Design a protein around this ligand. Structure first.
Ligand code: FES
Length: 102
């Protein structure tokens, strides 16, 4: 069923949270205008973590190359990002950010 990632309270808009859950690839947790989204953290273009880049609303920019993704959709937006980031459907369970065990 569900995997707890981090407390909802820990995720501020503009400051994504790296979560390393033992079943999963590195994960990134975001708050966009008060709502939570979860993506893979490893950039699809290289060896950088998206939680070390720059959130601008629904856009997360990679710390390298100027690449970017849409947090909410997974879309690769700014070049050189081309392969969409994996996203996960999010549930809040008792104050925790959760995703399904996949
Ligand atoms: S490693 Fe993220 S855009 Fe190149």
């Amino acid at each position: 069923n569900k995997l707890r990632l981090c407390q909802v309270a820990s995720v501020k808009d503009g400051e994504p949270v790296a979560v390393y859950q033992e079943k999963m690839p590195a994960l990134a947790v975001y708050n966009v205008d008060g709502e939570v989204f979860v993506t893979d953290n490893l950039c699809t273009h290289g060896n950088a973590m998206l939680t070390d880049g720059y959130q601008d609303g629904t856009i997360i920019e990679c710390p390298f190359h100027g690449g970017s993704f849409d947090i909410a959709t997974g879309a690769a937006k700014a070049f050189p990002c081309q392969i969409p980031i994996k996203t996960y459907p999010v549930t809040i369970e008792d104050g925790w950010v959760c995703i399904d065990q996949p």
